[PDB]
DNA sequence: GCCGCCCTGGAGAATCCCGGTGCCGAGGCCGCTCAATTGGTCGTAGACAGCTCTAGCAACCGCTTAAACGCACGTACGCGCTGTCCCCCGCGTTTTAACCGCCAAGGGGATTACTTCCTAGTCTCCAGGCACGTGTCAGATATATACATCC
C-alpha cells in the first residue's frame, strides 16, 4: 500500500529473525510479486555480491 | 793326673697394674646493668552498620566462522655406527711461591662520652593544581555543480 497507493516506493528495510526468514520470502513471492524484495545473509563475498 | 766341653738351677732386671695428685673444658655462682615488664592514660584504627551502583556467575539460547582435528603422504632429520686423529690425562721431575712466623711505624676505624645547632616533624591556615565536565573552533572528509572533451 505504501509503494503503490502513496507512491512511496523508496528503500525500505525489514529486520527479521533468521529462523522465520523463508516465511517472509514466500509471502513476498506470493502476495506482492511485483516488488523488488532482496535478501541479505551470507559470508563476506555473498554480501559483497 | 790334668785340662777342656755339655747340661741345669736360682737370683737380678724389665713390664703391667693401681693409687695419689695436678691441669684443661665446662658449668654454677656472682655482679653489673640495660632493656623487658607493669601499671595507668588516651587517641584513633578498625570493626560494624547502612545505602548505592556495578561486575560477576550459573545455566541456557542463537549465529557465524575461523580454528582445531583427523588423515594421507613424503622427506628431512634424529640417531646409530665407524673411522680418525688430536688433545687431554696420567705420571715423573724440577721449580717456586704460598704459608707461616717476623719486624717497623703510622693511619683508619670502632667504641665511649660530651656539646651544640640545624633541620625536619608538627600544627594551622590558605590557595591553586588536579580531576572532571562542557562550549567552541579549526582541520579533515565527502559531495553539488559547472566547464573541457571523445565518440
Which whole-number Å values give the CA distances from A10 to A29, A31, A36, in the listed order?
19, 19, 11
Instruction: Copy the grid coordinates of residue A14.
Output: 525489514
Nearest Cα to Cα of residue A3 among A38, A32, A40, A39 = A32
CA A5 – C1' B24 distance (Å)?
129
- What DSSP designation does A20 have? G
Taking the C-alpha atoms of residue A9 and residue A48, their distance in angstroms, rounded to an integer, is 24
Instruction: Copy the grid coordinates of residue A11.
Output: 528503500
Annotated resolution, angstroms: 2.6
Point out the nucleotide closest to A42 (alpha carbon to C1′). Answer: B64
Taking the C-alpha atoms of residue A45 and residue A4, their distance in angstroms, rounded to an integer, is 33
B strand bases under 7 Å from protein CB: 62-65
Point out the nucleotide closest to A21 (alpha carbon to C1′). Answer: B63
Taking the C-alpha atoms of residue A38 and residue A13, their distance in angstroms, rounded to an integer, is 10
Amino acid at each position: 500500500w505504501l509503494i503503490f497507493a502513496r507512491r512511496q516506493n523508496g528503500p525500505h528495510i525489514i529486520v527479521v529473525p533468521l529462523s522465520t526468514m523463508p516465511a517472509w520470502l514466500d509471502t513476498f513471492e506470493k502476495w506482492a510479486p511485483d516488488l523488488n524484495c532482496i535478501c541479505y545473509m551470507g559470508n563476506q563475498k555473498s554480501r559483497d555480491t
